[PDB]
Structure formats: structure tokens, C-alpha cells
Design a protein around this ligand. Structure first.
Ligand SMILES: [Cl-]
Ligand SMILES: [Cl-]
Lengths: 304, 304
């Protein structure tokens, strides 16, 4: 349990997790409390930092990654790939990312900042092209290891070990409902398991955006436009600046917070990622378009 | 009994400002000194200026100089100071107007506008001076408008004397031999130096300059090319992702770390801003130009 107030970290690893929790304030006009678990405050700005750490930590203990021998091969360019590149670099591993050429230049650049080898695959073959290429690499080099196997193996576990228990402690053992995205790669499974291990009867709600069954009490559907509108209202009302998945979660949480049986209760949801990564994407396009056509004051007004 | 954000739920994103982590430089430090990085990049809006933003609103309100829902906050800033004022202003219900030259990036316009700030553009030729002139015109024309710079002057050093400096003191276990930060303005330098000397520290105070004066023991000049190179080395060695200022500070720290008299000693410096804000600027153009020319694997190698 690393205490940031009284210590200097040996490694940026130690700054992963132990993220803040924040009550929704202006945007919450309901009779329920809504707690945001702020995973956007991780060192590389998303929840997936916990997964990147888990992969290196747990696979090394298993002897399946060997620092400075293993080449880590990851067929994904989103936050899991960012965290693997980030933490691979400081542990001494070469990291290869395979990604379609059609993924954004900005995604390429962030991965390369950490010294990953970025290998581009044909747009017309999509995500499958990148998976084929990763497999080609591992077949050719017996030192190379596919990361996605470990992402699958450890993801729910790290959230049952860390994220879930943090929420339990931060809310002082008071969670009536926990809400997160159904996507997997996320916190849903592990947080749900942690809560159920603590005794908690909390309602578990999976959020499914639109264009383990035992663990999930309800799937709540959220329209894309509502997730996007919510992300922008959240920043203006409460100063929380996040991506699409956080907007969808907050939209869902605010609806569920108005249910009669949720009055006086505590609802917890996740803010997975900081918003700045998405400024150039469709999420904030409306704002980009607005600022693109602003007028300019004439110099004749400014030279008195 | 001061709020513990790792163990309790915050009422406001304000409470998550400051109390940032501190991190030892390792792979990049091949000296016999210890270099501690104060990780201001970990603030809620990804820079040290969150502390100044908060100090401005909190202290101006307590002195009746800003009145929520009445005062219009006006700032001439193409930097993080404007970003923080816009971010925290929105939460508190203030209208915020930011003036900046038309030559600043769309990304920067977009960030401010995400908070709901009014963005006013001034001629490229007149630079920041023209943005300053316009801010003063706006304030002249609205009796509810106030110029934020006056507050930044009054409160900048004080907030770092009260918060950043005492944090550094506790985090290093009362053990600081040298403190290094940028002259700029908005820097931590004056306030931290005052805190350190108040708490009995004999730390040497070093002002970093590109190529209160009585608290400074040494000016250290850093060429821009060394600042830029150092920013990119930092990501790949230690996973620290920052801007130009942090690059320059770390370069200076590493050179001071080589002095015989610093053997065994503790040097503290500041990482002011997270690097993501700068990914599409000149600082990381070397990486961008590289990933924009990568070859694409031929479909024939992967089509199944
Ligand atoms: Cl998100
Ligand atoms: Cl910086």
C-alpha cells in the first residue's frame, strides 16, 4: 500500500491505482449519491494502467515474461497498448504494436513516444490483419510473446484485487449499485466479484452503448449521442473531463439515480480515461468545429 | 484532520488539486546523487497551474474580489494558466473569457471551449501583447468583469509556500539539498524556496533559464535542444511524459547531480505539465514525422 504523501516512489509503477473518488455535484439533481471512481487520474491517464502493470508483474512471476529477453507483441493501439508500451519501456522490454494503417496518427505517435516498434497493417484487413501480423511475429521469434493472452488472463483479477477494494474502502463499505461498461477489458467483472466477496448485495449494472450473467443484474443501453452530450455537460458542470465510456456511464448512473428505490442510496461508477486523448476524435468534434470558425479582432482595435 | 483522497470520497474536484506524488529518477540518472521529481503533471487538469487556478478563485472569493455568478473572469493566456482558470471557473459558475492569438492551435481553442469559456482571438502579428490589450478592453467595457492576472500576481508564490513546498518537505523525509525550477512566471520557485527556508532546510535554490531574486543561489541556463532531447529520453527511460519545462529542469538536475559535492545528496525538481497536451507541437515533432512515414505490411503477407 504505497503512501504518496510520505514517500518518494521508486518507480512510476507505484503511482498506478489508488485513484480518487468524487461525488457528482452540480450534474446530480437526484436524491441518490453518485460516486465517480477517477481512473482518468492514473499516470498514463486511464484505467488500463492497472492492466499493464498486472501483465508485467504477474507474467514475470509466472516466468512467462523475462525482462530484456521477451519481446512483447500487442495487437491493439488503444489504452491497453499505451500502457504496455509505457511500462515495457521502463522495464527494458522491446514492445511491438501491430495496428491498421487506418488508426489515427495520434495513436501511432503516443505509442512511439514510449519507444514501441509500431508496425502498420493494411486498412482493408482491419483488426484481423493486425492479429495475423502479431502471430507471424511470435511464430518467427521464440522470444516474442503475445500480450493479449495475459490481458485476458489477468484483467478481472487485477480489478478484484485493487479497484474493487479501493471503492469498498472509499465508500466506507456502502455501495448500493455499481455501474460500468459491458465491454470487458473493463472493471465490471472484478469489481463485482470484490463486492460479492465483501458480502455486498449491490446491484450490478452493465452499460452497453448503442450506435458472466450471474454477476450482472441489468444491462442498461445508452445511445451514442447521449454519451457524447453527457461527456460535455460533465466537464462544464463538475470539471470531469473524460472519454466516451465515461459519458455513457454517467448518463446511465444519473437515470438509475432517479429510481424510487435508489433514493438515499450510493451509486458508484467508473470514469475510465481522461478526455485529452480524445480532443481530435469524434467525441469532441462539435467543439472543434465551433472553434475552427471563430472571428479575429482587427489590429486597428488594439494599437491605441 | 486533512482530507485523504486515497481513502475517502471528495465533494469537489478542487480537493484533488495538489498532493501530487514524488518519484525518483532511475534509468536516466547514472550519478551518485538522488533526483526526486515533483509530479505536477498528475494534477486533475494535468499541470501545476491547477494550484494557481484554485488559489485565484479560493483566495479572491474569501477576500470578496470575485463573486460567484456575478464576476466575469478575464484572462489573456495561451497557456496552462488559462486552461485552469477556465476549468475551475465552469465548476463555480463563473463566465470565463480567454483572449489568445489566432496563431495558437485549434486544439488549445478546443480545450478551453470544452470548459465553456468564451474564446476571443487576436491578430497573429501582435502576439500575446495583443491578447493582453484585448483583455483590458473587455474588462473596461463590463463593470462585472475582472482581470485574472492581478490575482495571479498576488497569490502565485503564496500557494506554493502553503502547499507544494511543505509537500516536498514531507515526501523527501525532511531531506532536500538542492531545489531546481524554472524562472518563468507561475513557477513554483519563489514559494517553494520560502517554505524550504522556513522549515530550516539548507537547500541550494537553482533557477532554470532558457538559452524574488534574493532566494536564488544559482541561475542554470539550458539550451532548447537539450530540453527537447531530455523530454524524449525521459519517456523511454523512466516513463515520465512531460513538456519542455520539465525537460529543461531534468537536464539541469542531471548536470548538477554530477558535481562531487552532490554525492549522496537529494536534488528535487518539478515536472510542471503532462506531455499529452504537447504531442502535436514542436516538442515531439521528431516522433510524429517518424510515425507518419512508416511502411505498411503488404496484404499478400497476411490475407489469411
Ligand atoms: Cl472514459
Ligand atoms: Cl513540463
Amino acid at each position: 500500500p504505497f503512501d504518496k504523501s510520505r514517500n518518494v516512489a521508486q518507480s512510476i509503477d507505484q503511482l498506478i491505482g489508488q485513484t480518487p473518488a468524487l461525488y457528482l455535484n452540480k450534474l446530480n439533481n437526484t436524491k441518490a449519491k453518485v460516486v465517480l471512481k477517477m481512473e482518468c487520474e492514473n499516470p498514463m491517464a486511464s484505467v488500463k494502467d492497472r492492466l499493464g502493470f498486472a501483465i508485467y508483474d504477474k507474467a514475470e512471476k509466472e516466468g512467462k515474461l523475462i525482462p530484456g529477453k521477451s519481446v512483447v507483441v500487442e495487437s491493439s493501439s488503444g489504452n491497453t497498448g499505451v500502457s504496455l508500451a509505457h511500462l515495457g519501456a521502463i522495464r527494458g522490454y522491446k514492445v511491438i504494436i501491430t495496428m491498421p494503417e487506418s488508426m489515427s496518427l495520434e495513436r501511432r505517435c503516443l505509442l512511439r513516444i514510449f519507444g514501441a516498434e509500431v508496425i502498420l497493417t493494411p486498412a482493408a484487413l482491419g483488426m484481423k490483419g493486425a492479429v495475423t501480423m502479431a502471430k507471424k511475429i511470435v511464430t518467427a521469434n521464440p522470444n516474442a510473446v503475445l500480450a493479449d493472452q495475459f490481458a485476458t488472463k489477468y484483467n478481472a483479477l487485477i480489478h478484484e484485487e485493487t479497484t474493487g477494494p479501493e471503492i469498498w474502502e472509499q465508500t466506507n463499505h456502502n455501495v448500493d449499485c455499481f455501474i460500468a461498461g459491458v465491454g470487458t477489458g473493463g472493471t465490471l467483472t472484478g469489481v463485482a466479484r470484490a463486492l460479492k466477496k465483501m458480502g455486498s448485495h449491490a446491484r450490478i449494472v452493465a452499460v452497453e452503448p448503442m450506435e458472466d450473467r450471474s454477476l450482472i443484474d441489468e444491462v442498461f443501453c445508452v445511445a451514442g449521442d447521449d454519451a457524447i452530450e453527457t461527456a460535455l455537460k460533465l466537464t462544464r458542470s463538475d470539471g470531469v473531463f473524460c472519454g466516451f465510456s465515461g459519458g455513457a456511464n454517467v448518463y446511465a448512473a444519473l437515470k438509475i439515480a432517479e429510481r424510487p428505490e435508489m433514493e438515499g442510496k450510493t451509486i458508484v461508477t467508473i470514469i475510465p480515461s481522461f478526455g485529452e486523448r480524445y480532443l481530435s476524435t469524434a467525441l469532441y468534434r462539435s467543439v472543434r468545429d465551433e472553434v475552427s470558425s471563430l472571428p479575429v479582432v482587427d489590429a486597428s482595435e488594439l494599437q491605441d
